Design a protein around this ligand. Structure first.
Ligand SMILES: Nc1ncnc2c1ncn2[C@@H]1O[C@H](COP(=O)(O)OP(=O)(O)NP(=O)(O)O)[C@@H](O)[C@H]1O
Ligand SMILES: [Mg+2]
Ligand SMILES: [Mg+2]
Length: 298
C-alpha cells in the first residue's frame, strides 16, 4: 500500500515538519514528514487536503497521506507536487521581479485565499470556509509559470458552525507573530463573526503583497529583500514586540512615494494599504483584491 518513494534532499524545515524533494517510482514529489509528536498537525493538514472542494490551481496539489514505521517509532507523511522554485520568501531574496511577475503572483495569491474563504464552490454548491491563519511568504510556493500556490495548512481552521467561543479563546494567538493582524496582537477579536478570522488572513496577505512589491523593478530603484518589520524587530519576534510596532506605533512596512510613479504599483499599494488597515472592517476581502488585480489590463 505504501508508494515507491526515495528521499533525495531536505528543502524545508518548519515548526512542525521537514520537507524533502523525493522520487515516486510525475516522478519528482515533495514529502512533508511529521514525527509521531506532531500527529495533530499532520491530521489537521490531511483533513484540509482531503476535502474535495479544496482543489484549486492556487492551492498546493495533494497526492496522498501515509503512515511509515521507523526504528525510533513511526512517521506521518503528506505527499504533494514539488515546486522547484521553492517558497516565495527565498524566491524574492534571490530575484528582482518584473511588473508582469508581480501581477501574476499577486492575483494568484488573492485567488487562492478567496477560494479558501468562500462558503461555496465555483459551481454554486455550499462548502466550508477555511482560514489559513499562517499566511506568510515562506508558506507560499512559486510555480514554474510564476504564479502562487498556498501551502502549510497545519494551523488552518475550518470555519465549522459547531466551534465553541471558549474552544477558540485558547488555541490563543496562533500563527507567526511577524504577520499577526493588530486585533490578533491586541487579543481584541470578536470570537463570533465568521468574517473576523477571514479579515486576519487579509492583513497577512497585505504584508505578503508588500514583500512582492518591494522587489518589483517597476518601482525603479530596488533594495535588498527584507521581511516585513525587518529593521524594527529581532529574527524571531515575540507577540509583545510586534504589538509595540503594529498596534502602539501603528507601524506598517514603508512605501516610499517614488514607488507610486508607476500606475500599476500605485494601484497595488493602494489595495494593500486598505488590506492592512487597523480596523478589520475597513479591509478589502480577498475576492475584492482578486477583482482589482484582474482590472490591471493597462
Ligand atoms: N511542495 C513543496 N515544494 C517545494 N518546497 C516545499 C513544498 N512544500 C513545502 N516546501 C518547503 O518546505 C518549507 C516548510 O514547509 P511547511 O509546509 O511550511 O512546513 P511547516 O513545518 O508547517 N512550517 P511553519 O508552520 O510555517 O513553521 C516551506 O517553507 C518551503 O520552503
Ligand atoms: Mg510553513
Ligand atoms: Mg506550518
Amino acid at each position: 500500500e505504501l508508494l515507491p518513494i526515495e528521499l533525495d534532499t531536505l528543502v524545508g524545515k518548519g515548526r512542525f515538519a521537514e520537507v524533502y524533494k523525493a522520487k515516486l517510482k510525475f516522478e519528482t514529489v515533495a514529502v512533508k514528514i511529521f514525527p509521531y509528536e506532531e500527529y495533530a498537525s499532520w491530521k489537521t493538514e490531511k483533513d484540509i487536503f482531503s476535502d474535495i472542494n479544496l482543489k484549486h490551481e492556487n492551492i498546493l496539489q495533494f497526492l496522498t497521506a501515509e503512515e511509515r514505521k521507523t526504528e525510533l517509532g513511526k512517521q506521518y507523511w503528506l505527499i504533494t507536487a514539488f515546486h522547484a522554485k521553492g517558497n516565495l520568501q527565498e524566491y524574492l531574496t534571490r530575484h528582482v521581479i518584473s511588473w508582469e511577475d508581480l501581477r501574476k503572483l499577486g492575483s494568484s495569491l488573492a485567488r487562492g485565499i478567496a477560494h479558501l474563504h468562500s462558503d461555496h464552490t465555483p459551481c454554486g454548491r455550499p462548502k466550508m470556509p477555511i482560514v489559513h491563519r499562517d499566511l506568510k511568504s515562506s508558506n507560499i510556493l512559486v510555480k514554474n509559470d510564476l504564479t502562487c500556490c498556498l501551502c502549510d495548512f497545519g494551523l488552518s481552521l475550518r470555519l465549522d458552525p459547531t466551534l465553541s467561543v471558549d474552544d477558540l479563546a485558547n488555541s490563543g494567538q496562533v500563527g507567526t507573530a511577524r504577520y499577526m493582524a493588530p486585533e490578533v496582537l491586541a487579543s481584541a477579536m470578536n470570537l463570533e463573526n465568521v468574517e473576523s478570522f477571514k479579515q486576519t488572513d487579509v492583513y497577512s496577505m497585505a504584508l505578503v503583497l508588500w514583500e512582492m512589491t518591494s522587489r518589483c523593478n517597476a518601482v525603479g530603484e530596488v533594495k535588498d529583500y527584507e521581511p516585513p518589520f525587518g529593521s524594527k524587530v529581532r529574527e524571531h519576534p515575540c507577540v509583545a514586540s510586534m504589538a509595540d510596532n503594529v498596534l502602539a506605533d501603528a507601524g506598517r512596512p514603508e512605501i516610499p512615494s517614488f514607488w507610486l510613479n508607476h500606475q500599476g504599483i500605485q494601484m497595488v499599494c493602494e489595495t494593500l494599504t486598505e488590506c492592512w488597515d487597523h480596523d478589520p472592517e475597513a479591509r478589502l476581502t480577498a475576492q475584492c483584491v482578486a477583482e482589482r488585480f484582474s482590472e490591471l489590463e493597462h
